[PDB]
Specification:
Shape of chain B: elongated
Largest sheet of chain B: 6 strands, antiparallel
Largest sheet of chain A: 7 strands, mixed
Number of helices of chain B: 0
Oligomer: part of a larger assembly
Strand order of the largest sheet of chain B: 5-6-2-3-4-7
Shape of chain A: globular
Largest interface: D-F, 17 and 18 residues
Strand content of chain A: 15-25%
Number of helices of chain A: 4
Distance between the termini of chain A: 27 Å
Order of helices and strands of chain A: EEHEHEHEEEH
Order of helices and strands of chain B: EEEEEEE
């Protein structure tokens, strides 16, 4: 229950996975009518660590470009060389890519990223336990979403192509 | 010694030009210019006469003009010839050659 | 001198490749990658012609291609050949040989 | 040069093993292990061929395998041979030998 | 050696004068004098007799008076001759010559 | 070389023992042990074979066993032989001898 700005009550239903992190740079906007980045049938690359180097972002973009599919990178932060590479490939050749910060502050951020991985059918990179690296990325390690909408203040993933058994198992783990 | 752009290196110095930095990856991904470091591959364009390591004679440099060489990270002097970048090394600074 | 992947070391430099890092212990206990230091065992894959230690002649390097060698902790130069790691040392840097 | 556990030192390097640390005094009092410094007495187990100090010939190392020598505190390189500690010095690092 | 303005450098020292700083660009744009650094191009005006690199004879310097040379950034000594600037280098410091 | 307590110095090293510290003054005044510094007078008890300063032959050490010599303040290595203090120097470190 929150404050409304109108005279009457309204009910809003937030479907899918929506979190309060927008795009990192404003150059990823492709739909100017709402100032948002909208992709359909997009790959999803999830990183538990920050992406700031060239070698940690080239092969994911090579997979996206070879498969001719949009890429959404959800990480702790994309900055520096990797961010400049993303913006340069976006503006010059027209590469369908967007970069979003990972929501949460602490263990909840890791848990939310793992939930996104299970929902989308991808793998979390840069983790402590398993130590999967962004230099070695295969197409099966990337999640698949039917729809993604990224505005300035929030990101939203719709109809992720994960395994239903994985999702039920994660839900039961959350319940326990 | 062999000259180039009317420039002749003295002693055992070798004048090379660095190979062109790679702008796109093998998967067609464009790279930023500021993220491209100094290219350690070069081709030899000028050679000096050579120092006198032994007594009485001039030792020639181990590289000739046209050799593909691998440069070290440090040890090169910037030289501008007809508004174009070139680098001057010592003969012993050069790590190795690419022979074909 | 002997070349390798069309790369020939200059002077007394020796090009080796480090042995593969051990991933499991002798009882089947998996090791983290970031806890694996640089492998000091290597095999020689390329040798330079050799410097001129005495007057008038070339001293050959004390190791040939195919020798198993023990590298020191410091003194190796990173060399990338066909997207693969290799290391360049001076001939006097190598500690010892594994004979068989 | 002489090899040892199929390891041969290069140049004038000498491979030794440090003697066993004394655990009890002469009056039968046990000592803590962490209070035992590096044992400076050693026996020579491997010798290199030797460098070329003069022109044209190889100078042999001044110590042979089986000599007990007195090691300096600093200057030895750790070498692991068949899961056992060994130390690699230069020939001139060695202070002296015990003759019997 | 050859003297200049009643000044003869000793040993392998070379006295040059730096070329005049470029005041206007090729497009007609004048430059501030404080932004013009040291001109590395110079002409050789005096040479020394040379040192004795080998035994018993004097090695002459590799440059002669009138040679256009490229100086390094550091390593010169200011010499004032008849209220005019000149710079004294060692022979090995000069990077190369411009031969026409 | 000459051995002492079954210890032979290698190369040009010289093993001495420091002379006994003076406990009383010449007028019968006793001195604290802490205020007594290292005694720079010593007697030579062991000599090495000597290094090879010139080409082809061994240079003997300038001091023999039994020479009383003056030691420098720094440069001596502690050597324990049969629970007794001894000091190992290089041949050039010793300042002078007292001849009688």
């Amino acid at each position: 229950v929150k404050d409304g700005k109108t005279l009457n009550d309204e009910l809003e239903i937030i479907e899918g996975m929506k979190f309060d992190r927008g795009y990192i740079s404003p150059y990823f906007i492709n739909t100017s009518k709402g100032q948002k980045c909208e992709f359909q049938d997009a790959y999803v690359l999830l990183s538990e660590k920050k992406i700031s180097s060239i070698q940690s972002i080239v092969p994911a973009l090579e997979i996206a470009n070879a498969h001719r599919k949009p890429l959404v990178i959800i990480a702790e932060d994309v900055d520096g060389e990797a961010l400049s590479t993303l913006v340069l490939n976006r503006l010059k050749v027209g590469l369908q890519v967007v970069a979003v910060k990972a929501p949460g502050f602490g263990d909840n951020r890791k848990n939310q990223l793992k939930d996104m991985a299970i929902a989308t059918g991808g793998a979390v990179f840069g983790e402590e336990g398993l130590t999967l690296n962004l230099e070695d990325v295969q197409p099966h390690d990337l999640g698949k979403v039917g729809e993604v909408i990224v505005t300035k203040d929030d990101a939203m993933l719709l109809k992720g192509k994960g395994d239903k058994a994985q999702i039920e198992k994660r839900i039961q783990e959350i319940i326990e | 010694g062999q000259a180039f752009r009317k420039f002749l290196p003295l002693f055992d110095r070798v004048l090379v030009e660095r190979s062109a930095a790679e702008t796109v990856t093998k998967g067609g991904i464009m790279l930023p210019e500021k993220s491209q470091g100094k290219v350690l591959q070069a081709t030899v364009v000028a050679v000096g006469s050579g120092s006198k390591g032994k007594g009485g004679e001039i030792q020639p440099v181990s590289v000739k003009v046209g050799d593909k060489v691998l440069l070290p990270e440090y040890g090169g002097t910037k030289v501008v010839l007809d508004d174009k970048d070139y680098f001057l090394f010592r003969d012993g600074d050069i790590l190795g050659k690419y022979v074909d």
